[PDB]
Structure formats: C-alpha cells, structure tokens
Amino acid sequence: GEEERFRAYYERYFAALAARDYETLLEILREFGVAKLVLNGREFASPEEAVQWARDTGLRFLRLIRERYEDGVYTVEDIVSRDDGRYYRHTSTLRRQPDGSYVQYSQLELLGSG
Numbered sequence: 001g002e003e004e005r006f007r008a009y010y011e012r013y014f015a016a017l018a019a020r021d022y023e024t025l026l027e028i029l030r031e032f033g034v035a036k037l038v039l040n041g042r043e044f045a046s047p048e049e050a051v052q053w054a055r056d057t058g059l060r061f062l063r064l065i066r067e068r069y070e071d072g073v074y075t076v077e078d079i080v081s082r083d084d085g086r087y088y089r090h091t092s093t094l095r096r097q098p099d100g101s102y103v104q105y106s107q108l109e110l111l112g113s114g
Contacts (some may be wrong), residue, residue, distance in 0.1 A: 003069040006094075010067065010076060017054075017061040017080075026051045034094070035101040040108055050104075058083025072096035079111070087111040 009032050016024040029047040037044040037053075044050045053059075062079040069075075074094040081087050088108040095103050 002072070006069060006074045007067065010074075014061055014064060014078070017059065020058075020060065022051050022055045022059075025054060033101050034104055035097075037104045037106065039106045062087070080108075084113070086113045 009028060012028050013025065016022075016028065026047055029050065034047060034050075036046065037050040039050075039053070044053060060081045062081055065077040065079065067074070067076050072095065076090075076092045076094075078090050078092075079087065080090050087110075089111055091107045091109075093105045095105065097103060
C-alpha cells in the first residue's frame, strides 16, 4: 500500500507547513527516507538543506491542487508563498531509488507578487 503511505505522509507534510513548523517537516522527510532534493535543478544534499531553504525563505502553504500516484513515483502540485510576497506553483515528484531512499524533484514556477 505505497499509495496510502504517500498520502498520509503528505497530510503530515502540508499540515506542518501550514503551521510553518519546519522542524516537523525535517522529521517527516527523515522518517519517509527522502535523502536528497533537487529544486529547479539546484542540489540540496540532504533534508537539512531542504528545510534550511524552507526556513530561510519563510515558505508558506496556500493550496493543494492535485496528487497522482504511480509505482515508486508520487507527484503533487500545490501553491506556496515566500516571506517576500512571491507566489509559486510547485510540482514535486518523489522518486523511489533502488536502495529504497527517495529523491524529491521540485519545480517552482513564479506566479507573481504584489
């Protein structure tokens, strides 16, 4: 039931981001086995760097748009914002690796600012 595991993990994830609780995001990434994040092609070598990014930008959660499940590939699209008022369409693709860790590929597309 990898699809159920995916969805329950994302509930914990987005709810923690709705609380701006960046440390819980870290524990969830570690527990699920995400070893690496690549964001618009930039390497974040471990969950530490990913959550440092979230804290440093002041990442906020606005809206979930869709979730799609495939064997070893979980795709989510949501809307997020930063401290500086900028809004993004976020497409995350979590890919299971041969050794059972996951790599998250995030694409962030600017939706604008006030």
